[PDB]
Structure of PH-interacting protein:
Amino acid sequence: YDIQAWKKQCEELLNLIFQCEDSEPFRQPVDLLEYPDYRDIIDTPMDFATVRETLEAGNYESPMELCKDVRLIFSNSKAYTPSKRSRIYSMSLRLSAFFEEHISSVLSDYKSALRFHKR
Ligand SMILES: O=C(NCC(F)(F)F)N1CCN(C(=O)c2ccc(Cl)o2)CC1
Protein backbone atom coordinates (compact mmCIF):
# COMPACT_ATOMS: atom_id res chain seq x y z
CA TYR A 1 0.00 0.00 0.00
CA ASP A 2 3.01 2.30 -0.74
CA ILE A 3 1.41 4.96 -3.02
CA GLN A 4 4.92 6.21 -4.07
CA ALA A 5 6.48 2.79 -4.95
CA TRP A 6 5.37 3.05 -8.65
CA LYS A 7 8.06 5.66 -9.36
CA LYS A 8 11.10 3.43 -8.70
CA GLN A 9 9.24 0.47 -10.26
CA CYS A 10 8.86 2.60 -13.42
CA GLU A 11 12.49 3.71 -13.29
CA GLU A 12 13.61 0.04 -13.12
CA LEU A 13 11.21 -0.94 -15.96
CA LEU A 14 12.58 1.94 -18.10
CA ASN A 15 16.12 0.71 -17.30
CA LEU A 16 15.13 -2.80 -18.61
CA ILE A 17 13.54 -1.15 -21.69
CA PHE A 18 16.77 0.84 -22.42
CA GLN A 19 18.78 -2.45 -22.12
CA CYS A 20 16.42 -4.11 -24.73
CA GLU A 21 17.69 -3.92 -28.35
CA ASP A 22 14.08 -3.54 -29.48
CA SER A 23 13.89 -0.08 -27.76
CA GLU A 24 16.71 1.47 -29.88
CA PRO A 25 14.35 3.19 -32.44
CA PHE A 26 12.28 4.63 -29.55
CA ARG A 27 15.03 5.97 -27.21
CA GLN A 28 15.18 9.49 -28.74
CA PRO A 29 13.07 11.64 -31.15
CA VAL A 30 12.82 11.18 -35.00
CA ASP A 31 15.35 12.93 -37.34
CA LEU A 32 13.11 14.56 -40.04
CA LEU A 33 16.06 14.35 -42.55
CA GLU A 34 15.72 10.51 -42.11
CA TYR A 35 11.83 10.47 -41.98
CA PRO A 36 10.72 13.72 -43.70
CA ASP A 37 6.94 12.95 -43.48
CA TYR A 38 7.12 11.88 -39.79
CA ARG A 39 5.37 15.02 -38.31
CA ASP A 40 2.75 15.13 -41.15
CA ILE A 41 1.28 11.87 -39.66
CA ILE A 42 2.35 12.15 -35.95
CA ASP A 43 1.05 15.34 -34.21
CA THR A 44 2.15 14.08 -30.71
CA PRO A 45 5.67 12.57 -30.65
CA MET A 46 6.94 10.47 -27.70
CA ASP A 47 10.16 8.52 -26.91
CA PHE A 48 11.57 6.71 -23.87
CA ALA A 49 14.11 9.46 -23.04
CA THR A 50 11.23 11.98 -22.79
CA VAL A 51 9.29 9.51 -20.58
CA ARG A 52 12.35 8.93 -18.32
CA GLU A 53 13.05 12.69 -18.10
CA THR A 54 9.37 13.41 -17.27
CA LEU A 55 9.49 10.76 -14.50
CA GLU A 56 12.85 12.02 -13.09
CA ALA A 57 11.56 15.65 -13.20
CA GLY A 58 8.68 14.70 -10.91
CA ASN A 59 6.21 15.53 -13.68
CA TYR A 60 4.18 12.30 -13.56
CA GLU A 61 1.60 12.13 -10.79
CA SER A 62 0.70 8.45 -11.37
CA PRO A 63 1.90 5.42 -13.30
CA MET A 64 -1.26 5.78 -15.47
CA GLU A 65 0.19 9.02 -16.90
CA LEU A 66 3.54 7.30 -17.65
CA CYS A 67 1.64 4.35 -19.20
CA LYS A 68 -0.30 6.84 -21.45
CA ASP A 69 3.00 8.30 -22.77
CA VAL A 70 4.62 4.86 -23.31
CA ARG A 71 1.51 3.68 -25.17
CA LEU A 72 1.75 6.84 -27.35
CA ILE A 73 5.26 5.69 -28.39
CA PHE A 74 3.71 2.46 -29.64
CA SER A 75 0.64 4.05 -31.25
CA ASN A 76 2.91 6.52 -33.07
CA SER A 77 4.93 3.56 -34.43
CA LYS A 78 1.72 1.83 -35.60
CA ALA A 79 0.41 5.07 -37.22
CA TYR A 80 3.73 5.87 -39.01
CA THR A 81 4.59 2.34 -40.18
CA PRO A 82 4.12 1.83 -43.97
CA SER A 83 3.40 -1.89 -43.19
CA LYS A 84 2.58 -4.42 -40.40
CA ARG A 85 5.89 -6.09 -41.55
CA SER A 86 8.12 -2.98 -40.97
CA ARG A 87 11.22 -3.85 -38.87
CA ILE A 88 10.79 -0.84 -36.52
CA TYR A 89 7.05 -1.51 -36.09
CA SER A 90 7.76 -5.22 -35.35
CA MET A 91 10.27 -4.08 -32.64
CA SER A 92 7.49 -1.80 -31.22
CA LEU A 93 5.07 -4.76 -30.89
CA ARG A 94 7.60 -6.91 -28.96
CA LEU A 95 8.58 -4.02 -26.71
CA SER A 96 4.87 -3.19 -26.10
CA ALA A 97 4.20 -6.79 -25.03
CA PHE A 98 7.20 -6.61 -22.65
CA PHE A 99 6.06 -3.23 -21.29
CA GLU A 100 2.39 -4.35 -20.77
CA GLU A 101 3.58 -7.58 -19.07
CA HIS A 102 5.65 -5.51 -16.58
CA ILE A 103 3.42 -2.40 -16.05
CA SER A 104 0.32 -4.50 -15.10
CA SER A 105 1.52 -5.09 -11.47
CA VAL A 106 2.74 -1.46 -11.13
CA LEU A 107 -0.73 -0.14 -12.05
CA SER A 108 -2.54 -2.75 -9.91
CA ASP A 109 -0.35 -2.04 -6.86
CA TYR A 110 -0.67 1.75 -7.22
CA LYS A 111 -4.47 1.65 -7.65
CA SER A 112 -4.78 -0.76 -4.67
CA ALA A 113 -2.56 1.50 -2.54
CA LEU A 114 -4.66 4.59 -3.42
CA ARG A 115 -7.93 2.71 -2.65
CA PHE A 116 -6.44 1.71 0.77
CA HIS A 117 -5.40 5.36 1.32
CA LYS A 118 -9.01 6.53 0.66
CA ARG A 119 -10.67 3.54 2.49
O1 LIG B 1 13.93 7.37 -36.20
C1 LIG B 1 13.31 6.83 -35.28
N1 LIG B 1 13.76 6.88 -34.03
C2 LIG B 1 14.82 7.80 -33.63
C3 LIG B 1 16.19 7.17 -33.65
F1 LIG B 1 16.49 6.64 -34.84
F2 LIG B 1 17.16 8.05 -33.38
F3 LIG B 1 16.31 6.19 -32.75
N2 LIG B 1 12.17 6.13 -35.50
C4 LIG B 1 11.70 5.79 -36.85
C5 LIG B 1 10.24 6.13 -37.04
N3 LIG B 1 9.45 5.47 -35.99
C6 LIG B 1 8.57 4.47 -36.12
O2 LIG B 1 7.89 4.15 -35.15
C7 LIG B 1 8.39 3.65 -37.31
C8 LIG B 1 7.44 2.74 -37.60
C9 LIG B 1 7.75 2.20 -38.85
C10 LIG B 1 8.88 2.78 -39.26
CL1 LIG B 1 9.72 2.50 -40.70
O3 LIG B 1 9.30 3.69 -38.33
C11 LIG B 1 9.86 5.96 -34.67
C12 LIG B 1 11.31 5.59 -34.45
Notes: Residues 83 and 89 are 8 Å apart (CA to CA).
